[PDB]
Amino acid sequence: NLVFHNKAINGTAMKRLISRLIDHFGMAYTSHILDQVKTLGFQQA
Amino acid sequence: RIPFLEEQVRKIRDGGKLLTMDIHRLLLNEDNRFDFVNEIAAEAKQYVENNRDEYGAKKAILHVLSNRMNDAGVYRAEAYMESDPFKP
Amino acid sequence: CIKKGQILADGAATVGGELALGKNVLVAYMPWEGYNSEDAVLISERLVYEDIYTSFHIRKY
Helix, strand or coil, X not given: CCCCCCCCCCHHHHHHHHHHHHHHCCHHHHXXXXXXXXXXXXXXX | CCCCCHHHHHHHHHHCCXXXXXXXXXXXXXXXXXXXXXXXXXXXXXXXXXXXXXXXXXXXXXXXXXXXXXXXXCCCCHHHCCCCCCCC | CCCCXXXXXXXXXXXXXXXXXXXXXCCCCCCCCXXXXXXXXXXXXXXXHCCCCCCCCCCCC
């Protein structure tokens, strides 16, 4: 149920997204989400 | 129902990310996170004082956490030990 | 024939009368699977079996 994004995502956008996911899901879900985001970012780069 | 999702589930079950979820779930019913640590330490000491070698599968703390998670309706392995059957 | 001031023998970290503290290697600048997210280098295995960056060290006791 995450917001669909169609614009560029800079560092501040990622920081705000993580700060909102910590409050909405918790640290347990956010850790795995951040790990998967890291993997996808490394693959794309 | 995503079809291609079994790989990361197996990775979670194997790498040991289940304990990170179980600790956070158990910290949802306790007010202080220090009394919970003290209670777990006391229970582990009482369980290791009875049987020295038979503290569980490998350790006692993991055994205590598995016993606490199995009494709430969540099936967990004995002391979170699952060997790899594909090791030659 | 030789003159005063010309090289008769070489030395360590010197070849042809010039300082030589390293080797020439083919290098590309690109991100590679996060192994160089920080300041880090992903080297090839050729530098191990071709005796490129091999050095000697002598310790006394």
